[PDB]
């Protein structure tokens, strides 16, 4: 059973721009370079985000974490039984990722996915942010979330819920012009309101954005100014209707956006699926 989103890798055209963006603007910690690419940290894990040179300028792969080897075995079986082509990552890949075991495959629309267990911790190299950030919220909630753009939401849903086991949190009917309303589906696999959202948006990228959650309002406020100085803000500060996260959006060097937020509410046993007609209570004025 998937416990959380553990890591993500980006294939970008300008690695230097990304390095500077992630550390100086967002405050991530530079963790060195390896055959896994330029590594970045936000907590005790050896790395959470990897940046590799590439032409797509998009998310290259995402890794989902299971608790142990038994969990890995369950998932591999679930995928096989579903007719998905799964590959047991070899020792070489596992060493490159810094994990104990992993299986690889792709989602229905070609996004490379990895499910692994036993990632590396580096408590002996205490996290020191590249900019003034009090802390990032990970723990049992994992890395954060990302919005997967797909040509067919229903096909994507069946795969993520029935095969991968994500559960629906809620749906937002996004009005994109008078003759267009696109439902966005928010899915959770732990307490975090959503670790994955699915929507059929007309974008050239695999994801609309990825999100990182910080510990205080000031972390968000200071980061906003740092990003704003370079004219990279895409949405003003606002609060979402569904997860109640206070956040802003900005452009990364690849065009893909990043959401930087604070104070999201979690999902619990009493949770019930609901629908919304707006993605924000207040703010989030688009300045794109």
Under the criterion CB under 6 A, does residue 240 sit at the interface with ligand BPY? Answer: yes
Is residue 259 a contact point for ligand BPY (CB under 6 A)?
A: yes
Which of 118, 84, 82 has its CA nearest to residue 102?
Answer: 118
Name which of residues 164 to 193 contact ligand BPY (CB under 6 A): 172, 184
Q: Is 242 near ligand BPY (CB under 6 A)?
A: yes
Judge whether 240 is annotated as a binding position: no
Contact 21, 83 (CB under 8 A): no
Question: Do the Cβ atoms of 239 and 254 come closer than 8 Å?
Answer: no
How far apart CA 13 and CA 210 sit, in angstroms, is 18
CB of 16 to a copy of itself, least distance (A): 22
Residue from the set 65, 114, 170, 259 that interacts with Fe ion by CB under 5 A: 259
* Residue number, 19 or 192, with CB nearest to Fe ion: 192
Shortest distance, position 248 Cβ to a copy of itself, whole Å? 10
Question: Taking a C-beta distance cutoff of 8 angstroms, is the pair 264, 193 a contact?
Answer: yes
Work out the number of other CB atoms within 10 angstroms of the CB of residue 162.
Answer: 11
Of the two residues 172 and 233, which places its CB atom closer to ligand BPY in the complex?
A: 172
Where do contacts with a copy of itself occur on this chain (CB under 8 A)? 3, 65-69, 100, 117-124, 126-129, 131-132, 139-140, 168, 170-171, 217-218, 221-222, 224-225, 228, 236-239, 241-242, 244, 246, 270-278, 280-283, 285
Binding Fe ion by CB under 5 A: which of 76, 211, 223, 264? Answer: 211
Distance of alpha carbon 18 from alpha carbon 164, whole angstroms: 30
Residues with Cβ within 8 Å of 205's Cβ and at least 6 positions away in sequence, in order, are 58, 59, 149, 254, 255, 256
How far is the first Cα of the chain from the last one, in angstroms, to the nearest whole number? 39
| Contact set with Fe ion (CB under 5 A) | 211, 259
- Footprint on this chain of ligand BPY (rule: CB under 6 A): 147, 172, 184, 197, 199, 208, 211, 240, 242-243, 245, 259, 279
């Amino acid at each position: 059973s998937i416990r959380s989103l553990g890591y993500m890798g980006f294939a970008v055209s300008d690695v230097a721009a990304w390095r500077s963006f992630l550390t100086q603007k967002l405050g991530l910690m530079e963790a060195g370079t390896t055959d896994n690419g330029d590594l970045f940290r936000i907590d005790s894990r050896a790395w959470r985000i990897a940046v590799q040179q590439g032409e797509v300028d998009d998310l290259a792969f995402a890794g989902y974490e299971v608790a142990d080897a038994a969990g890995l075995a369950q998932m591999a079986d679930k995928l096989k039984q579903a007719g998905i082509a799964v590959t047991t990552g070899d020792a070489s890949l596992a060493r490159r990722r810094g994990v104990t075991g992993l299986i690889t495959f792709a989602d229905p629309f070609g996004l490379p996915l990895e499910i692994y267990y036993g990632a590396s911790e580096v408590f002996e190299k205490p996290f020191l942010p590249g900019a003034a950030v009090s802390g990032f919220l990970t723990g049992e909630q994992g890395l954060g979330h990302f919005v997967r753009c797909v040509p067919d939401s229903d096909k994507a849903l069946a795969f993520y819920t029935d095969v991968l086991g994500f559960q629906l949190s809620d749906v937002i009917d996004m009005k994109m012009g008078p003759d267009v309303t696109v439902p966005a589906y928010f899915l959770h696999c732990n307490e975090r309101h959503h670790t994955l959202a699915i929507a059929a948006f007309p974008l050239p990228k695999r994801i609309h954005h990825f999100m990182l959650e910080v510990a205080s309002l000031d972390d968000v406020g200071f980061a906003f100014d740092r990003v704003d100085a370079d004219g990279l803000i895409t949405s003003t500060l606002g609060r979402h209707t569904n997860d109640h996260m206070v956040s802003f959006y900005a452009s990364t060097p690849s065009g893909v956006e990043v959401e930087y937020g604070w104070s999201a509410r979690t999902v619990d046993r009493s949770w019930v699926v609901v629908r919304h007609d707006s993605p924000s209570m207040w703010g989030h004025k688009s300045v794109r």
